[PDB]
Amino acid sequence: APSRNGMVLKPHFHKDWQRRVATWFNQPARKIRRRKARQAKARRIAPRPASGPIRPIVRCPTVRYHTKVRAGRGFSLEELRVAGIHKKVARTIGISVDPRRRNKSTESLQANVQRLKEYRSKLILFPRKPSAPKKGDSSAEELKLATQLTGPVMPVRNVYKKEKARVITEEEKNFKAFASLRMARANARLFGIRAKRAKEAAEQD
Amino acid sequence: MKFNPFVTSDRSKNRKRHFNAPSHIRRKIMSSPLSKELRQKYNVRSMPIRKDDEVQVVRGHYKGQQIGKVVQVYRKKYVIYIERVQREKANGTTVHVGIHPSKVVITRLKLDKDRKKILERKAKSRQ
Amino acid sequence: SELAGHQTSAESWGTGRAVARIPRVRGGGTHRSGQGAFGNMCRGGRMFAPTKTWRRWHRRVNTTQKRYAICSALAASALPALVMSKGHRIEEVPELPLVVEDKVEGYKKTKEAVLLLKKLKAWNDIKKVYASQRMRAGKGKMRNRRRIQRRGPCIIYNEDNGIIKAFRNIPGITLLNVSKLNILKLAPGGHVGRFCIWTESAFRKLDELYGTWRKAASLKSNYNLPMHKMINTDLSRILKSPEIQRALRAPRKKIHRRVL
RNA sequence: CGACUCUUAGCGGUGGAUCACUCGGCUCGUGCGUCGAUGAAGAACGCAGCUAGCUGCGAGAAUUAAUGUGAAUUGCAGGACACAUUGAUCAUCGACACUUCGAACGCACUUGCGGCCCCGGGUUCCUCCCGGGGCUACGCCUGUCUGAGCGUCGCUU
RNA sequence: CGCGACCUCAGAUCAGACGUGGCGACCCGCUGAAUUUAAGCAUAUUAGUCAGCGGAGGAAAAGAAACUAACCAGGAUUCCCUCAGUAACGGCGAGUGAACAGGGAAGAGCCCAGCGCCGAAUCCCCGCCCCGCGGGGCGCGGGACAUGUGGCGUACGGAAGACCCGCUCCCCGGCGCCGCUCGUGGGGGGCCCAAGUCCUUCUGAUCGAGGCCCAGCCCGUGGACGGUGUGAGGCCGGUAGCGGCCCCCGGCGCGCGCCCGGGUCUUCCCGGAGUCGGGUUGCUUGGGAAUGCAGCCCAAAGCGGGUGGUAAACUCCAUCUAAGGCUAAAUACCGGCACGAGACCGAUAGUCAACAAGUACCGUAAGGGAAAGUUGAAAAGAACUUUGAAGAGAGAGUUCAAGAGGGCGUGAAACCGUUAAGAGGUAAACGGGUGGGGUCCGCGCAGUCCGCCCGGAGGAUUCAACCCGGCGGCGGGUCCGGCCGUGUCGGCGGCCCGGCGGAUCUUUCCCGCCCCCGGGGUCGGCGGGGGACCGUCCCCCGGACCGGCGACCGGCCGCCGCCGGGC
RNA sequence: ACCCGACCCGUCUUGAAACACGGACCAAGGAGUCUAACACGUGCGCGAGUCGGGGGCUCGCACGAAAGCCGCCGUGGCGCAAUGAAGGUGAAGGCCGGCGCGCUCGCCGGCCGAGGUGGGAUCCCGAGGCCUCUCCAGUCCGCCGAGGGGCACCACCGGCCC
RNA sequence: AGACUAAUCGAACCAUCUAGUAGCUGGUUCCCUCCGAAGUUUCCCUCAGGAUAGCUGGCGCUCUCGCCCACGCAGUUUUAU
RNA sequence: CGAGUAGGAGGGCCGCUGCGGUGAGCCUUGAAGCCUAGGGCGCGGGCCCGGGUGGAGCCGCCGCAGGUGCAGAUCUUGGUGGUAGUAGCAAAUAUUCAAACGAGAACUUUGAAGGCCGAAGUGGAGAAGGGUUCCAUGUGAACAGCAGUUGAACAUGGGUC
Ligand SMILES: [Mg+2]
Ligand SMILES: [Mg+2]
Ligand SMILES: [Mg+2]
Ligand SMILES: [Mg+2]
Ligand SMILES: [Mg+2]
Ligand SMILES: [Mg+2]
Ligand SMILES: [Mg+2]
Ligand SMILES: [Mg+2]
Ligand SMILES: [Mg+2]
Ligand SMILES: [Mg+2]
Ligand SMILES: [Mg+2]
Ligand SMILES: [Mg+2]
Ligand SMILES: [Mg+2]
Ligand SMILES: [Mg+2]
Ligand SMILES: [Mg+2]
Ligand SMILES: [Mg+2]
Ligand SMILES: [Mg+2]
Ligand SMILES: [Mg+2]
Ligand SMILES: [Mg+2]
Ligand SMILES: [Mg+2]
Ligand SMILES: [Mg+2]
Ligand SMILES: [Mg+2]
Ligand SMILES: [Mg+2]
Ligand SMILES: [Mg+2]
Ligand SMILES: [Mg+2]
Ligand SMILES: [Mg+2]
Ligand SMILES: [Mg+2]
Ligand SMILES: [Mg+2]
Ligand SMILES: [Mg+2]
Ligand SMILES: [Mg+2]
Ligand SMILES: [Mg+2]
Ligand SMILES: [Mg+2]
Ligand SMILES: [Mg+2]
Ligand SMILES: [Mg+2]
Ligand SMILES: [Mg+2]
Ligand SMILES: [Mg+2]
Ligand SMILES: [Mg+2]
Ligand SMILES: [Mg+2]
Ligand SMILES: [Mg+2]
Ligand SMILES: [Mg+2]
Ligand SMILES: [Mg+2]
Ligand SMILES: [Mg+2]
Ligand SMILES: [Mg+2]
Ligand SMILES: [Mg+2]
Ligand SMILES: [Mg+2]
Ligand SMILES: [Mg+2]
Ligand SMILES: [Mg+2]
Ligand SMILES: [Mg+2]
Ligand SMILES: [Mg+2]
Ligand SMILES: [Mg+2]
Ligand SMILES: [Mg+2]
Ligand SMILES: [Mg+2]
Ligand SMILES: [Mg+2]
Ligand SMILES: [Mg+2]
Ligand SMILES: [Mg+2]
Ligand SMILES: [Mg+2]
Ligand SMILES: [Mg+2]
Ligand SMILES: [Mg+2]
Ligand SMILES: [Mg+2]
Ligand SMILES: [Mg+2]
Ligand SMILES: [Mg+2]
Ligand SMILES: [Mg+2]
Ligand SMILES: [Mg+2]
Ligand SMILES: [Mg+2]
Ligand SMILES: [Mg+2]
Ligand SMILES: [Mg+2]
Ligand SMILES: [Mg+2]
Ligand SMILES: [Mg+2]
Ligand SMILES: [Mg+2]
Ligand SMILES: [Mg+2]
Ligand SMILES: [Mg+2]
Ligand SMILES: [Mg+2]
């Protein structure tokens, strides 16, 4: 079968694929199902925003993506506890709750507490009975719009650094190096044996 | 132009609903316009038709000022039979030729309780 | 087809009988028994490569080329030679592109349409469409396509405020929003230069929405108007200019046919 | 000469091509998304004034009551032709019925053969009296009733 | 002997409930080949698929981590784009083939045993009443369930108990209505624009032409169909947050049923076994020194257990909490109930089935499974006269037509019938070449040129010039008379009464914060505003080119058509 | 009618009028398709960039199952960077001087910054003469020996990364 | 006797998988203009087939001839060897 | 300068069918088809024109899309021939004369003669299976392999205790 110069092609068509093929001609219909599903979700609720649970702020776990940031799933129980509010109180406020999430980094941890202080500043709620506890006055006709768009706070807003200008100094262009990667990379590979070779040097005696 | 999404602009579906209509739907397709002096009194454009309506034919080979009486209304063939509309067979016996009542002008009606009540509902809604 | 091109079941006789080697259905009595079964060349056989629903129907086109096509098709609709060459009646019309007021887009009744188009001298085009509403040629009359009707003008507008109700059932007209343009409406069939009525806010939104070469398009992403192949394109005025016809050789017009 | 054979052409006949029409298929997409021990799907037979198929219904059998529509059904007779009497025809369907077999349910399946309980008649309770109706499958769930155990005990002759 | 208790049990046409069966497109649990491909053929591939078997629903399954990770770490499932034809597998051949990231759709999370506390505080049935209709429930007495342990607080995110602190009055279904409901809640019924206007074709007309400088009438109704053919107005429907009639359901309010929550500290409480794991043996997976399942044997622990991708120790650390349970979404649908659309097929096509099709009929049966649409506008389906007994015909009639006469539209070709013409010994036929005849066709038959120009003959019209009248048009230079064009620039003009952007800046400017010894401190760092700067583009006087498709007057010779003069 | 020419078409085949095969005769049906993937070629759009292909926004308007938009939707795909089994590393030289025994020898300071040779379309400089008395003078057209900086690309040398 | 087992037997019948596979036979539907071959090499469980070269076609590209001597090429001679 | 199988390219105002565009195209005053000793055009694919039939839709040009072009496959299905008024209607001994009804008699009915099955029957009755075939009347287009005035045919009506 093969011939003059061409690439080896191995397609996966020995398996009788024509019985099992999903065809996307139902693609405009579901798209109109789903706008009319979100808009049916829009006019049920009330003043509360669609996509209304607020999400936390989470850095992306790898070496590849950890220089960007992402709306996670739920505020940490210990994050949310620094704001001081109880668990199932908080979901009625409209905050997402996640028990699985730790907090190793207080720069991460306090950044979400600032976000909850933001949202609880942001919040205009309504009571059942106007006994005036954590409630709102006649407030900007339900604050000028009932519903928000794509999260309440624009969760990405990925923060950039300027560090605008500086003079270059002595002893940085004198000392820094390529080689202080290579010296340190080779330092890490030999920490085990350099510990042991000197340990059996003094164990010899 | 059709702006309902739930109505037929199909040729085959409309002919199917035509020739397989129920009888009480079949009353309204065989509707006939009234004479324009009589429509001034009633304020109605056309009427469903019945057994004793005096009728002026307008189209056919039998045209113009022949106001007789109707006798049968075959719903099954979408065809009425009028008194005056004749034609002989071969064997000396007369028979009645039928005309579809899109081609018929009603000059006299039959007046009864339920014929008035339609006519009020027709005349009010034209408004 | 998908299935039941051949619901039937058959095997072939083969050698010792004089017929052929098409499969023949199994049984007797019913006089299809013994006939030719599936394949191309038989009664009640399947077709050749029974057509499949997963053919490549839809075609994807680059977003700059689509916008290139709208930019070109709008450009044809500003020359009277091209737009009469499509077939429209502009012989007594008002000057090309023709901006009617933004007061138009709040009309209610449709006598207000007819009184408009007879005063703008566009009514001659509609009266062609009345003369051209003949019946289909072919078999399309069975499959719901029965009226052939040639197009007329199209009113390009923004801020729909009643014009779509008043201009709706004019015969052969396409009532078309500015910021949602089609190539299938502006140049139907692929022959450019449809006669088009622009509105005031329509014809003033085009400066914003496509931009000059000098500024950007302040209503889209990163679309300047696409740069040109020639700038000054009068072929005759170039070739009669003093620069060229100083520089040329000479003309040469003798014929010098076959010498016997 | 005719006879015959062949070639065309007009006209006739065999046959049903082409063309035109379409109450039909396939394909896509939408909204719903519901069957049966209160006896299903399926099968059998029956039923119309004239009726065999198709459809429709089930001894109330070409459907009844009601609701809606308001005057026909139709190949032919006939009838209430009424409709300020309760109203012809169709459509809908929310009332009533649904014969035989089928998980099919008394036992079998040969319309065979029974067993109780009750009413009608008739030897005025019965005895295998005729008609009429109900009940009478299996598996199992909790509850109830009857009673078996040198299972384990008490109290005890 | 005799009774009584309980446990194991059986009996019933006992009281009352329940399962069985069907359709099976999509889903779920097991079982499972082979043709095919490797150019042969076993492993492999076909494929954990077709067929077999069992279960269910409008979805199912899955699911709130014995997870991914390996660094600034994520954080239930399901689905889509990518990772990817990639790591891996494999006579390392043919081939097979994941996942975590990342971006989307959708987002909803919880309970129980154990641990003890509350006197079984709980439950089912019966009895008797309560209650309002459409029907099912809440308050009293007895009989069981039940300590081999119902119920309340309780779940690994900790929780409980006792202090003390802080404040707190809630929530729940019915019920009766006033009111609204994203195309404007769902269902069905009846209804709503405008010509048959004149003339005219035709068997019939829905054609063909026309209606006052306001274009004949209606248009939120020109989609489609019917009606002797091609219809916005002749009829049904179409248009519309149009109109009313009935039926149903989801959004505010008189009475029931229920109610201590939040913080810190002290005290103690804190878990799932023949299961995990290990051995092996089959099968499966990309999973390889064994991914998962399963049989057999061996069989657990508590600082434990599983994992962390090459077997095996010695570790350090990361991370999760197994052997109990439930849960909408987005996802799937070639069966079923309605429905609209088609660059589809138009009867030998399309389903096998446009039709009395899963039917006629074959096979005992499992099963197999065809053909067959077309009169006309309307039946007006040929009365009567006349041969034969009738079939069959000649006259007659109906129809625009019987050259549409009951498989009846058009009715080809094969083949056959007769009439006309022509020919006939090397089977017919064919190519080249003329010929003869026939056929219609064309000309008008020797009688065929057309229009141009001038010099001649005969009647009528009005020029040209040449000026004046007046319109329109083309053609030129000063930039002329303005604009605008194209640019070097000046004002930096709008800079905060500007448009866009800028990893240009600015602790000499605020604020949410981190710092040093209640505050200031400039010692550095985070983030939102502000405003100089540019870099383009919205202005104002000036020059530098240009009058270039950018349009107007001025004026110029010369064209021009109409008036009036003049042969 | 006649002269001359004249074996029956498809098929395999070294060869068919073949004593080779299929073909009684007419009508209709009837056979390189579609999806994926790769490769070269070509048209078009953009250009160190490109791509909405999956989603969202538009009012729900017949054709709309269309089209239009996003850009703090550019995640990603393919490309810009390679090589090694892997740890990993990852593409600038040339000119004028200086320091050491200025050597099989490396370093120090400026100045442009992708080497060189042969070929090489096109372009530029062109001596030189060419057009009615003669001088005397600038534009000018065309020819132009020879010379010059040299594209694409090929052949070869040097260098740089692993 | 390899018989008979529903006119079927040295493995029945029916339907599916199945349009199984085939290097092997047969067919492969409009005209015109241009260009126009091979049965050979090597290897293959290769010998009725492919792979590869050879042969063929197409699409381009880079140049030169248009004005006493060109550049280049060859199934040819000549002159040397 | 022209050859051409296998083959590859190019041009097609060649044809068929469907879709946007255009032809102020076309037509009940006759569209499609189909036939045609009718007139032509093109090298050719194929077309235009006249006449005759029929009676309701159809074609050009620019683009787009094909399930798109037949002489062949022991082609599939349909249809008709030459063979052809030919083979053939030959198993088991057999008919004849007259008469009636009837358009019509080698066969139907009656009557007489000549016959054969010859009691293991060409007879009298059933089980199986067939399901109205039984009986009667009526017709003579089918069917009964000639014919029919007949029937186990068609049509109507009966009968199975
Ligand atoms: Mg090959
Ligand atoms: Mg397969
Ligand atoms: Mg349809
Ligand atoms: Mg099948
Ligand atoms: Mg078929
Ligand atoms: Mg046609
Ligand atoms: Mg003769
Ligand atoms: Mg004929
Ligand atoms: Mg037929
Ligand atoms: Mg009733
Ligand atoms: Mg009883
Ligand atoms: Mg093979
Ligand atoms: Mg497998
Ligand atoms: Mg299966
Ligand atoms: Mg079941
Ligand atoms: Mg269900
Ligand atoms: Mg679900
Ligand atoms: Mg679960
Ligand atoms: Mg890839
Ligand atoms: Mg596999
Ligand atoms: Mg119509
Ligand atoms: Mg109409
Ligand atoms: Mg109307
Ligand atoms: Mg495997
Ligand atoms: Mg542990
Ligand atoms: Mg352990
Ligand atoms: Mg380890
Ligand atoms: Mg847990
Ligand atoms: Mg679990
Ligand atoms: Mg047909
Ligand atoms: Mg069929
Ligand atoms: Mg008819
Ligand atoms: Mg007679
Ligand atoms: Mg006729
Ligand atoms: Mg006919
Ligand atoms: Mg006819
Ligand atoms: Mg007709
Ligand atoms: Mg041959
Ligand atoms: Mg032979
Ligand atoms: Mg042969
Ligand atoms: Mg033969
Ligand atoms: Mg054909
Ligand atoms: Mg390309
Ligand atoms: Mg990216
Ligand atoms: Mg033997
Ligand atoms: Mg046998
Ligand atoms: Mg054998
Ligand atoms: Mg095949
Ligand atoms: Mg199949
Ligand atoms: Mg086969
Ligand atoms: Mg050649
Ligand atoms: Mg070989
Ligand atoms: Mg061969
Ligand atoms: Mg070549
Ligand atoms: Mg040639
Ligand atoms: Mg044509
Ligand atoms: Mg044509
Ligand atoms: Mg097609
Ligand atoms: Mg085909
Ligand atoms: Mg051929
Ligand atoms: Mg053949
Ligand atoms: Mg024959
Ligand atoms: Mg004979
Ligand atoms: Mg003989
Ligand atoms: Mg006699
Ligand atoms: Mg007689
Ligand atoms: Mg004898
Ligand atoms: Mg006998
Ligand atoms: Mg008899
Ligand atoms: Mg008789
Ligand atoms: Mg006979
Ligand atoms: Mg009979």
UniProtKB/Swiss-Prot annotation, chain A:
There is a cross-link at residues 122, 144, 173, 176 (Glycyl lysine isopeptide (Lys-Gly) (interchain with G-Cter in SUMO2)). Higher levels of expression in benign breast lesions than in carcinomas. The modification Phosphoserine is found at residues 51, 76, 105. Its main location: cytoplasm. One of its GO terms (biological process) is translation. It comes from the Eukaryota. One of its GO terms (molecular function) is structural constituent of ribosome. There is a cross-link at residue 173 (Glycyl lysine isopeptide (Lys-Gly) (interchain with G-Cter in SUMO1)). It is linked to Spondyloepimetaphyseal dysplasia, Isidor-Toutain type: An autosomal dominant bone disease characterized by early postnatal growth deficiency, severe short stature, genu varum, platyspondyly and severe epiphyseal and metaphyseal changes in the lower limbs. Component of the 60S large ribosomal subunit (LSU). HAMAP family: Ribosomal_eL13 (MF_00499). This is Large ribosomal subunit protein eL13. It comes from Homo sapiens. The lineage of its organism: Eukaryota, Metazoa, Chordata, Craniata, Vertebrata.
Swiss-Prot record, chain B:
PANTHER family: 60S RIBOSOMAL PROTEIN L26 FAMILY MEMBER. The keyword Ribonucleoprotein applies. It comes from Homo sapiens (Human). Keywords: Cytoplasm, Diamond-Blackfan anemia, Isopeptide bond, Phosphoprotein, Ribonucleoprotein, Ribosomal protein, Ubl conjugation. Disulfide bonds: none annotated. Signal peptide: none annotated. It is linked to Diamond-Blackfan anemia 11: A form of Diamond-Blackfan anemia, a congenital non-regenerative hypoplastic anemia that usually presents early in infancy. Diamond-Blackfan anemia is characterized by a moderate to severe macrocytic anemia, erythroblastopenia, and an increased risk of malignancy. 30 to 40% of Diamond-Blackfan anemia patients present with short stature and congenital anomalies, the most frequent being craniofacial (Pierre-Robin syndrome and cleft palate), thumb and urogenital anomalies. Residues 1-21 are annotated as: Disordered. GO terms for cellular component: cytoplasm; cytosol; cytosolic large ribosomal subunit; cytosolic ribosome; extracellular exosome; membrane; nucleolus; nucleoplasm. It is found in: Cytoplasm. One of its GO terms (molecular function) is structural constituent of ribosome. InterPro entries: KOW, Rib_uL2_dom2, Ribosomal_uL24_CS, Ribosomal_uL24_euk/arc, Ribosomal_uL24_KOW, Translation_prot_SH3-like_sf. Ufmylated by UFL1 in response to endoplasmic reticulum stress, promoting reticulophagy of endoplasmic reticulum sheets. The keyword Phosphoprotein applies. The gene is RPL26. Coiled coil: none annotated. NCBIfam families: rplX_A_E. This is Large ribosomal subunit protein uL24. Belongs to the universal ribosomal protein uL24 family. Component of the large ribosomal subunit. Interacts with DHX33.
Curated annotation (Swiss-Prot), chain C:
Citrullinated by PADI4. The modification Phosphoserine is found at residues 236, 241. Its main location: cytoplasm. One of its GO terms (molecular function) is RNA binding. Component of the large ribosomal subunit. The ribosome is a large ribonucleoprotein complex responsible for the synthesis of proteins in the cell. Component of the large ribosomal subunit. May bind IPO9 with low affinity. Interacts with RBM3. This is Large ribosomal subunit protein uL4. The chain holds residues 55 to 314 of 427 of the full protein.
